[model samples]
Target: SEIRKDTLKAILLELECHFTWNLLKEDIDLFEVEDTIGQQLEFLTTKSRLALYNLLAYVKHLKGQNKDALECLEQAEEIIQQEHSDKEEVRSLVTWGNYAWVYYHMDQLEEAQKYTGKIGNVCKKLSSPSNYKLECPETDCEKGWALLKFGGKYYQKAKAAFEKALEVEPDNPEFNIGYAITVYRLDDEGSVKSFSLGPLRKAVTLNPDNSYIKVFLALKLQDVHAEAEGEKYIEEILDQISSQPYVLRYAAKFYRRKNSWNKALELLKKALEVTPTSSFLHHQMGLCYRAQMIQIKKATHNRPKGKDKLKVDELISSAIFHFKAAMERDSMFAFAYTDLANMYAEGGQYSNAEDIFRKALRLENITDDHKHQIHYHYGRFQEFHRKSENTAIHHYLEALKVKDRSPLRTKLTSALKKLSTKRLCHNALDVQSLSALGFVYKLEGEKRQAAEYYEKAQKIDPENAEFLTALCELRLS
Candidate 1:
């Protein structure tokens, strides 16, 4: 019996599928993605829905819900029968592989081999080296989607997968859309190694009816500061489908970026009507109120007057409410935690802000970039609210030491530079102060002076890599 089970396990292992795709749970926010897919299920087309179902099945397996996982695959197969009945075997390849993997995990070895046998026989007809799988655009597209859903580090893998799919079917709408999204996600604010504008244009042209991908194209155009053109795409999309929640949320985001906070809130309120439980909508609403509060504070240069005071108070509480809602729906939303903390400080609840910031630091599965952001904001809270220069400088240096380069790093460097200038006359040899000055100079492109400060800091603290690595880098420069 053990020998029989072991042989079946070997067969299942050879299948190229989501289960074998190395999508680690730590790399993505499963609850967020699952909720997003639930929204997409109603809007996305049939053929692409198969990949979503397969992805949903993979998520269920990760969530330890095998029965539901099987049901998802079952639904996917039913769609294949209805949509691609003539080329059933080819289209069913990914589902069959997913089916085998789910059953294998379920410990139903015989049932697993039942599907494996089906795939082996069909793949044999294609004259491939392997009897278990076929190299085709369908499989490549599914793989690309699975990688895309896994998020984080998978964008590059998703890009490569879509590239392979596009190589075969150059005009495939699905493949082009997938490539468009991968590059869009890969576009960093700090550095521009890749561009999403052209890719997004191609995808938008290929998939005219796909309002979901059009939201992304609109956003990318906004990124290039083409708001007039971007607004045109948004208008076309809204004209076609006004009730779509995903479109509403992103469209709301575009308005917020334009500083049309009230307009953004209007769309967000409508989206909440359709998908009340969406973390993204709640977050956008929170951002709208937050931006409004900042603008009011800046122009007034103080607290609002007697009548306006109540309105500003309302903004703080409303921002706090929506941000809390966002984090309530997704515990792994690390940004929400910091935003809530910052709002707490704005409301003058300094201790509550401190508590939330510390909680954010304890949040697991967050990348270094997230950590960098948390420290920068937390440092701001200390400098402004707590009135502690030492703690603020400490946080600014800690944020830079994270070594995860992001657009936020530039802000952190600037904060450190301004603070360091004020503090350097007090203590010339303080490791934190010296390191902070060096980091600012390094970013400001003053090479020798940056090296001198790092060298001095390195002499004081040889064990800390903060000084060691900067000195090494400074030596090169």
Candidate 2:
């Protein structure tokens, strides 16, 4: 029976390796029940079975088979109870911590909290130990992550756990990542801490093999427009990593932001080859095509009468091809559909544009905010092609529901005035909105009304250039 123990260890290791690879690759196939059952066969010893059962339940839960997963999890509890003397606290700790992730994903917040409490008790009990590296770090690191996830619901305890984990392994990247998440969840204050990326960088130094870490760092780096550095770091993981679809997609994202569209497209093409059904990549390819269309449209509009029309035609054709491909891949891809709609609108295909937008509205992906925008763009299209002021006003009102932000408030205000309506700043009642709305009113022959909104906006932002300009213009009149 003990001879089977080594065989079981080997199977468990394979199971873990497969699970890690599958999660990083975003492959749903690994979550299959058979593969999980195979992994369950690995452990004959009571200690190993505790770990195996917990992990098996987690896999089943991840597969969307929650009922079966719960049954397995209940069995794990029974096994833990029966084998209390046979299993170490560390084994139970690992089991609970890993299962916490399953609970979180299942949206079982209370159950997740139960596991996190288990973690705190064990961590405090084991706090005196000097070598967590030799201990069950899967428990320590994964529990830290779990606490960070639950901490948003109760912050102080979560932060304390992250601090404890960090103290245990100061250079541990996973712990730092956990800490960063906790800080980020604090909203604006969290945003400041999240922007640091220092802990992430340290994590990079400590865990070079984790592609998820590299990807996370790359995304954060791109946020700061340290694109070159981000690309370099991503490339470190990307080299020889040709088959991973997520890797290619992210590589493409980095290059796209860098405006290296050609390189971006190349990587994305490789990714598309791997995950041929990836709707997101198709959407991005549509973006590349749309950008080219913009350039060609501008050139054609500004071109001399003698210049070749063929160039513009070719660009439009290319754009159309990509947009069609994107739609074919994912009909509910609202942004790409919108781009196609806009292209049709520009060509005076009013019926086509309206129809496309209606289809876009039906998509579950389109938020109320996006619906508001669709209405606005349709308004602009109607105004441009049909000169329908009534239609434009209806669309503008729809956009009014979008909950505008600063700077954009100006544009929405301008649109409202063009449609002969009052402005509703909603969340965008900042100085910029006031000045922009005021300017719109003044232009529309409602100087006094414009002045009123403008003054209110100015109070919020006393010295902004737009506000000052609008105020002066009003005074001059």
Candidate 3:
């Protein structure tokens, strides 16, 4: 019965199956799901245990623990034999797949071939496709994990795969948690409205030992007036989840937002210890130091001059060190370059500040908001350090052209308005001065004032291209 023609052909072809798990460039800890494998095993179902052991086997294989990998696969098979003999074909797909993969990785070709034969036998008996296109939650969730393992550009597809998995297994704790993390990764910056935290809560309810899910739920509650509740969740998990780089990175951000700078710095430092190459963690640590620098400045402001100057200098140096480290780790991290330049300007290192600002300006593929930041900060440097009002105004206008909602933009607008007023008061009837004032007012969306100034300019110089074009553009609007 197990020797049918189709099954024989499948087994022969499966012998040549080259299964490999290509690990992503991301941190390995980011992909690990287990807090404590032995402790969590008691809570898993037969199918969940099967999937867990299979995933563990792959992870062990990736870690070059082939013996441990084989042991994990054996545990998976034991789970199937003891608890799911009735649904062996369906439940065995994930287990058999991992068995084949791990055995191949260990160069145990015969054992790999044997498991492949078992897989072929089951598929032929069930009349399923060779790839085992079973529309079950276990299969879908396994597929989700496979996509997710690749990370990076595959994250969006992984999110979709996890959603599909949840559609089949609505209450599956693993699937719920996977989907929640996928959703969080998909969230873009500037997205203010929070996504549903239902998956996180459901996952926590299903698996109480999952401290990371609890942390996420707490993070979601940060702005919901549930301060005590959120803090409780965070406090409970801080020690447990600190080893995971992604968790530390996000948790540090949450604390930073809450103005707990010291706590944020501690977590960020811990994260850097694990993922020393992470530019984001480096930049965030720099931001925390900068925040401390501000606190020192304020605290020392009302005190006697030169009091705590050494302390403030130390904070500034720490911030600069981290910012430079971040930029060194990732050259395209334009924001770090901007922050470093601003710090240089703060220390009155004019030449060094200008150099980094130039680097920021040259960075390619930066977002509009990033460009806005680069221009805005450079404008500040020119305004204060160089005392070049016109050059500063030029950069400020460039910044507002990119995006105009920031505090920097507001300050730029105020400065430009004052400068334009001064110019107009000095030469009220000058066409060039009137046109400059009109352009400045136009940047602030004060169209009526802009039109009045533009009309005055046009009357004085009817053929000026810049003034005529601005007037026409405003009239059309």
Candidate 4:
């Protein structure tokens, strides 16, 4: 029965039908029933064991047992290699593509790179690169996803590969959904509008049970803020989803908006189990921790630290770890860099904090807000650390040049005024000019004039960590 084409091919056909049917519908029971056949085949079909093993592997993966499933699939691969020519080339390519998908989800970029290359080589073999029918459905749907992902590092190539997946099965819910997700990353809101929503809508229609398609559609709709429709679509999916990763991720955003930190964190944590180590997941978790801290702090304003202080510190520490991880994934991640720098400054590590700002300057991705933070921090550092009054003035002036309202402008002006008094004229005044000028204005004797400069410096940078330290020193003196 195993050797006869009648037996193995028939089972494979049924497997495809099962997959296709459930793909359009949300029948978990149906997936399990079809998957059971493959499991049964492992014992029933001696000659087709490898194919059966591969099917079992795929089932395990979809069920979220990635590590165990990868091992089974690789075992299947080894068996198929020895019996080459009997294997389905497209299926073989798809199998490897699944490996790449697993790695990508796990945030193992290096492993993803290797299997993605295998998928690419298979693509070349099936169709030459120059004439490659990138406009067709991908040989493997997951391969398209891997390219869309890792391909941000290689935009053009990624786009071409995604186009091919769409070309392969323009109507396929999986392919169409994948392509749509990529288009969102590539196109602007205006460009997205030009594309027919029908492909995605049709995919949802065909797979009426698939909540993932609905979720993505809702996300796209939200982008346009057809807000009422998007909200309705998401609610419909929420009604159907049992406990899938997509649903959990959506719920995270929903609850986070409602200020339900515990609920938001619970859902986000489940999603992370499916997509471990993702920058997005880590970032979301980190933000939830931070929000919870704020709530706790507000509730205990009069008692900032009993057990609450410990909780606050723990939450802040966790936030720092997530921010650091996000930056590690993408060094150019400006918000992460800026936030981490603020944490360092809060912790009294000024030198380390300045280093983060300097790194942020190299990133084109940094925003105007981040750019301002960099200059402001540098100005404050110079005002405190640099012994030269002139150097401090220069840095503070540079900070203002980047943009005004720099909390340091007053201090720089005060220092300049003091220097003006010591020197006879503006051109000669530097810090040296302040002493002679203070005497002439009889300002050296007038404690009020000296106090004005000091007050100005303190007012301009009241929150600065350096200013606090310096103020404490003055009090001690």
Best candidate according to TM-score: 1
Residue by residue across 283-393, what tens digits does model 4's lDDT show?
667878878877887899835677888988898899888878767765545667767776676567778777876787566543344455565555555555544555544
Candidate 1 residue pairs that clash: none
Candidate 4 wrongly placed segments (more than 4 Å): 1-87, 93-136, 140-143, 151-157, 187-199, 238-247, 254-262, 272-280, 291-318, 321-338, 344-477
By lDDT, who's the top model here? 1
**Clashes within 3 Å, all models in order:** 0, 0, 0, 18
Off by over 4 Å in 1: 1-10, 45-47, 188-194, 301-303, 306-310, 365-369, 387-403, 410-477
Please rank every candidate by lDDT, starting with the best.
Answer: 1, 3, 2, 4
Error of 4 at 6 (Å): 43
lDDT of 3 by residue, 202-319 (tens): 7778878766677777777775557678888888877776566666766787798788988898888887776677666788899988887787778778342564777677778898
lDDT of 1 by residue, 354-389 (tens): 889998878776666677788888889999999898
Pairs of residues at least 3 apart in sequence or in different chains that clash in candidate 3: none
Best to worst by TM-score, what's the order? 1, 3, 2, 4
* RMSD (Å) of each candidate, 1 decimal: 4.3, 13.7, 10.9, 18.0
Q: Candidate 1, 190: how far from true, in Å?
A: 4.9
- What are the clashing pairs of model 2? none
